[PDB]
Amino acid sequence: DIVMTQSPLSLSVAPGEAASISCRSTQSLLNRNGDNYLEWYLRRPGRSPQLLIYLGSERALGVPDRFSGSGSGRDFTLKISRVEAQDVGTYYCLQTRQGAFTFGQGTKLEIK
Amino acid sequence: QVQLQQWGTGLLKPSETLSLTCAVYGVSLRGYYWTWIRQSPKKGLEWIGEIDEIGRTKYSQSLRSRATLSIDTSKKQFSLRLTSVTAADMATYYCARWRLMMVDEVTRHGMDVWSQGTMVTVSS
Amino acid sequence: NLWVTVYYGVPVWRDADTTLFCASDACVPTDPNPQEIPLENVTENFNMWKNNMVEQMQEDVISLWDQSLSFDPIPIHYCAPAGYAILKCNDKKFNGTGPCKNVSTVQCTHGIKPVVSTQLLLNGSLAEEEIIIRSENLTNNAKNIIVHLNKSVSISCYCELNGTEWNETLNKVTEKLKEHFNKTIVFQPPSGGDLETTMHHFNCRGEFFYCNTTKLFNTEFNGTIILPCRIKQIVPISGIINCTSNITGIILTRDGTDETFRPGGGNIKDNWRSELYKYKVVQIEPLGIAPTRCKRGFLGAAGSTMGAASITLTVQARQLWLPDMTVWGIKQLQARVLAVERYLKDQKFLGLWGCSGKIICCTNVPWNSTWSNKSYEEIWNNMTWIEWEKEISNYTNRIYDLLTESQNQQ
Ligand SMILES: *[C@@H]1O[C@H](CO)[C@@H](O[C@@H]2O[C@H](CO)[C@@H](O[C@@H]3O[C@H](CO[C@H]4O[C@H](CO)[C@@H](O)[C@H](O)[C@@H]4O)[C@@H](O)[C@H](O[C@H]4O[C@H](CO)[C@@H](O)[C@H](O)[C@@H]4O)[C@@H]3O)[C@H](O)[C@H]2NC(C)=O)[C@H](O)[C@H]1NC(C)=O
Ligand SMILES: *[C@@H]1O[C@H](CO)[C@@H](O[C@@H]2O[C@H](CO)[C@@H](O[C@@H]3O[C@H](CO[C@H]4O[C@H](CO)[C@@H](O)[C@H](O)[C@@H]4O)[C@@H](O)[C@H](O[C@H]4O[C@H](CO)[C@@H](O)[C@H](O)[C@@H]4O)[C@@H]3O)[C@H](O)[C@H]2NC(C)=O)[C@H](O)[C@H]1NC(C)=O
Ligand SMILES: *[C@@H]1O[C@H](CO)[C@@H](O[C@@H]2O[C@H](CO)[C@@H](O)[C@H](O)[C@H]2NC(C)=O)[C@H](O)[C@H]1NC(C)=O
Ligand SMILES: *[C@@H]1O[C@H](CO)[C@@H](O[C@@H]2O[C@H](CO)[C@@H](O)[C@H](O)[C@H]2NC(C)=O)[C@H](O)[C@H]1NC(C)=O
Ligand SMILES: *[C@@H]1O[C@H](CO)[C@@H](O[C@@H]2O[C@H](CO)[C@@H](O)[C@H](O)[C@H]2NC(C)=O)[C@H](O)[C@H]1NC(C)=O
Ligand SMILES: *[C@@H]1O[C@H](CO)[C@@H](O[C@@H]2O[C@H](CO)[C@@H](O)[C@H](O)[C@H]2NC(C)=O)[C@H](O)[C@H]1NC(C)=O
Ligand SMILES: *[C@@H]1O[C@H](CO)[C@@H](O[C@@H]2O[C@H](CO)[C@@H](O)[C@H](O)[C@H]2NC(C)=O)[C@H](O)[C@H]1NC(C)=O
Ligand SMILES: *[C@@H]1O[C@H](CO)[C@@H](O)[C@H](O)[C@H]1NC(C)=O
Ligand SMILES: *[C@@H]1O[C@H](CO)[C@@H](O)[C@H](O)[C@H]1NC(C)=O
Ligand SMILES: *[C@@H]1O[C@H](CO)[C@@H](O)[C@H](O)[C@H]1NC(C)=O
Ligand SMILES: *[C@@H]1O[C@H](CO)[C@@H](O)[C@H](O)[C@H]1NC(C)=O
Ligand SMILES: *[C@@H]1O[C@H](CO)[C@@H](O)[C@H](O)[C@H]1NC(C)=O
Ligand SMILES: *[C@@H]1O[C@H](CO)[C@@H](O)[C@H](O)[C@H]1NC(C)=O
């Protein structure tokens, strides 16, 4: 039962530079030993969403190293080095700390 | 290469049970958490429930009243039923599969494989 | 920022050698209802020419024969002891050596009838799909070739044979050897100097039979085949004592225009490598190390994902079987004592560290970039326990010593 917040709601990012997504919660997500109970997912139009970031900031197989994550406790950030054709879509946070989970409103990312 | 397929109705009139089945091909059920996610056009994704392989279940308090989950290990399938579905409650779009690891806790990595999913509609 | 942690009971195995159990209905433990465990996504490299079952079963049959003080062969099983396992390569075209998939686990084996013969295989287990050629060195060697037949033949011994199946089987065998050997195949009698290993030796309810076979292998069946045969006199026109059996495999030997194969030859053990070729004895190693973020049927998981195998382990394994209230015997007692010592040694290793009897514990041993320069994802969600153990086995002693020192220094 955590109200979950993402920002900005809509993004307008030109190619060639990094793009940043901020993500905040209400109750602290830091684990006493685990890095973070937060995940980042991506959904493309008309496709099944896949995995980007799990359990803190370490990426998984299939990442082009172009996405990375950081943050702790209250503020979480995900940054993209380069945006050309396949990372355009919508980004979601995921709080997996306790009880009922909440994805929160997604962030739309496209190209000018 | 593991893949997920989904069977169900999709088109049903309001206020009865929506029963949907989902099968996995590529790996057994022994070491994962099989879960599903509601996908509303206005609410995005929302966690509905998860089941282990021995039948223990976890639900959400908002949907615990009228949702049931079950496993069939004979052919590696698993299904759900929602009683008295409503037009505003447009649920159970995608299947899923979470990864797991155990050190003094059942820690939860990210979920990797995604079913094609299905579209659910409710009549008047 | 990765810390060593210790798992006990992981499904990691390795090739080894040990003494097995008898099983029959000296060494007579009753055999109850058996079971089989499938495996997934695991590849096993089988090599039946370097197997270890053959010597054990040869020793056991020698002991049985010596105990004379009626001897119809009975299905005898060799049943693995506690702490070991029997792996079966169930591939359709498993020629005998090489990698194979769809390997399964059994608590222990199926019925084997100890029957001695040369130049022919009697009552043996049939093939599955096609004619199988078995040889350690097919291309060039003075080593015997074993031909395993899918179409059984009947024999009755003066041996009486139905020549139709013989003609069909020889046609099949020569066609099946055609692709391996370019020269035309022709069969010649052994041309040996004595009847010790160039004849048809077998036994029928205490009577020895040395039965000629030169009419079967020559450069037309013409109906029923009649074979002269002799009985071992102890210090004439006979040989029909209504003794019927099944021909299932052939032993052939190559020679150094056209290719010429000579039957017979070899020793008695190679009659027996043709029955235990599907099997391998393996030893479980229930201990492992793994890097994590923490700071402070027992084999179905093998072949699956790192984490999936990690989470499915439980405490159901009491130690490390089926029969009860019987006579142990020397071999079973030896195996059980060895297993108990191995379990006690593993418990001593756990007790020396901080696990103190628990399955998963964390220790104050920082990870290194030289034991493995692999990503955490790669380590913990995409590789089997067996491959990880094989990769890390080089530095296991150093890991153990560092763990002991760190635990002591605290
Ligand atoms: C680890 O070990 C497991 C177990 O042996 C292996 O899984 C086997 O191999 C694949 C999965 O990798 C399975 O084959 C897949 O089956 C799916 C479902 O099959 C149903 O539909 C077919 C349709 O004809 C029926 O024939 C069948 O009986 C089932 O009713 C298929 O949908 C998959 O098809 C894929 O390829 C076709 C192209 O041929 C595409 O069109 C499809 O969209 C899809 O992409 C696939 O055929 C197989 O069934 C598994 N065995 C068992 C017993 O279930 C893993 O492969 C193995 N892992 C590795 C890495 O080797
Ligand atoms: C490969 O596999 C085949 C299986 O088909 C083996 O052939 C068997 O060989 C054994 C050994 O001789 C045969 O055993 C015999 O059993 C007789 C009893 O037969 C009973 O069943 C028949 C069924 O029709 C009845 O008609 C009959 O009345 C019986 O009720 C015994 O009588 C034989 O001798 C025994 O008894 C006499 C006294 O009567 C003693 O003096 C002897 O010492 C001995 O104890 C004999 O034991 C068996 O019948 C064969 N099978 C078949 C189907 O006929 C092959 O032997 C095997 N290959 C090798 C190399 O072993
Ligand atoms: C993770 O392991 C899986 C199998 O366990 C690998 O999957 C296949 O691996 C082969 C050889 O490595 C490739 O030729 C295939 O293209 C792979 N298929 C898929 C769907 O991945 C996979 O490559 C491994 N991944 C990593 C990063 O090690
Ligand atoms: C059994 O089959 C395996 C492969 O299915 C054979 O192994 C390969 O054989 C070829 C041809 O002799 C060699 O060039 C390869 O180097 C072999 N690979 C390995 C890993 O051994 C094997 O030779 C076959 N054996 C028989 C008796 O047919
Ligand atoms: C199979 O047998 C052949 C024949 O002996 C082996 O080839 C010989 O290899 C030795 C080296 O050990 C050479 O000195 C000989 O000149 C080779 N002879 C021929 C005819 O090639 C071959 O190495 C064997 N292979 C296997 C897998 O056993
Ligand atoms: C020897 O075996 C052959 C093979 O079974 C027997 O020939 C068969 O005879 C039946 C009819 O009796 C036919 O339907 C089959 O097609 C024949 N098979 C072949 C391969 O020709 C033959 O009768 C047997 N002879 C003896 C004396 O046992
Ligand atoms: C097995 O049978 C062959 C039948 O050919 C025996 O060899 C023959 O022996 C006779 C004399 O005994 C010769 O006249 C033939 O020329 C031989 N033929 C061949 C092809 O060698 C052979 O002696 C028999 N084996 C035993 C042990 O008696
Ligand atoms: C694997 O072996 C089992 C053993 O019974 C068999 O049923 C199955 O058909 C085999 N499958 C393949 C793909 O070899
Ligand atoms: C050989 O054939 C006979 C007759 O069909 C059969 O009884 C026997 O079981 C066969 N041998 C084997 C090993 O199956
Ligand atoms: C036995 O193997 C040969 C190999 O070519 C094949 O032609 C024949 O059909 C097989 N017979 C059976 C009964 O499988
Ligand atoms: C028996 O073998 C001869 C040898 O070539 C062959 O010509 C003949 O066709 C065979 N008989 C059959 C197959 O019925
Ligand atoms: C007697 O021997 C003959 C061999 O010519 C064999 O066919 C028959 O089966 C034998 N008798 C019995 C009862 O088996
Ligand atoms: C890693 O191991 C090497 C040699 O095994 C050693 O020199 C080095 O100090 C180790 N690193 C750490 C951080 O302990």
mmCIF file of C-alpha atoms and ligand atoms in Angstrom, chain C residues 136-141 254, ligand 5:
data_model
loop_
_atom_site.group_PDB
_atom_site.id
_atom_site.type_symbol
_atom_site.label_atom_id
_atom_site.label_comp_id
_atom_site.label_asym_id
_atom_site.label_seq_id
_atom_site.Cartn_x
_atom_site.Cartn_y
_atom_site.Cartn_z
ATOM 1 C CA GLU C 136 36.398 -47.317 -29.527
ATOM 2 C CA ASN C 137 38.367 -46.753 -32.764
ATOM 3 C CA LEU C 138 36.220 -47.475 -35.811
ATOM 4 C CA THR C 139 38.540 -46.035 -38.455
ATOM 5 C CA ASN C 140 41.664 -48.146 -37.781
ATOM 6 C CA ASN C 141 42.289 -50.451 -34.828
ATOM 7 C CA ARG C 254 38.382 -55.974 -38.909
HETATM 8 C C1 LIG D 5 42.576 -44.723 -34.022
HETATM 9 O O1 LIG D 5 43.585 -45.603 -34.504
HETATM 10 C C2 LIG D 5 44.474 -45.004 -35.455
HETATM 11 C C3 LIG D 5 45.366 -46.110 -35.970
HETATM 12 O O2 LIG D 5 46.315 -46.507 -34.989
HETATM 13 C C4 LIG D 5 45.236 -43.867 -34.782
HETATM 14 O O3 LIG D 5 46.095 -43.237 -35.724
HETATM 15 C C5 LIG D 5 47.471 -43.459 -35.345
HETATM 16 O O4 LIG D 5 47.921 -42.499 -34.382
HETATM 17 C C6 LIG D 5 49.276 -42.712 -33.960
HETATM 18 C C7 LIG D 5 49.556 -41.710 -32.866
HETATM 19 O O5 LIG D 5 49.071 -42.164 -31.610
HETATM 20 C C8 LIG D 5 50.214 -42.577 -35.155
HETATM 21 O O6 LIG D 5 51.547 -42.848 -34.737
HETATM 22 C C9 LIG D 5 49.806 -43.547 -36.254
HETATM 23 O O7 LIG D 5 50.599 -43.331 -37.416
HETATM 24 C C10 LIG D 5 48.332 -43.366 -36.606
HETATM 25 N N1 LIG D 5 47.920 -44.352 -37.592
HETATM 26 C C11 LIG D 5 46.959 -44.125 -38.493
HETATM 27 C C12 LIG D 5 46.661 -45.255 -39.433
HETATM 28 O O8 LIG D 5 46.355 -43.059 -38.546
HETATM 29 C C13 LIG D 5 44.248 -42.853 -34.222
HETATM 30 O O9 LIG D 5 44.942 -41.849 -33.491
HETATM 31 C C14 LIG D 5 43.228 -43.533 -33.309
HETATM 32 N N2 LIG D 5 42.221 -42.578 -32.874
HETATM 33 C C15 LIG D 5 41.493 -42.737 -31.764
HETATM 34 C C16 LIG D 5 40.499 -41.654 -31.472
HETATM 35 O O10 LIG D 5 41.629 -43.710 -31.031
#
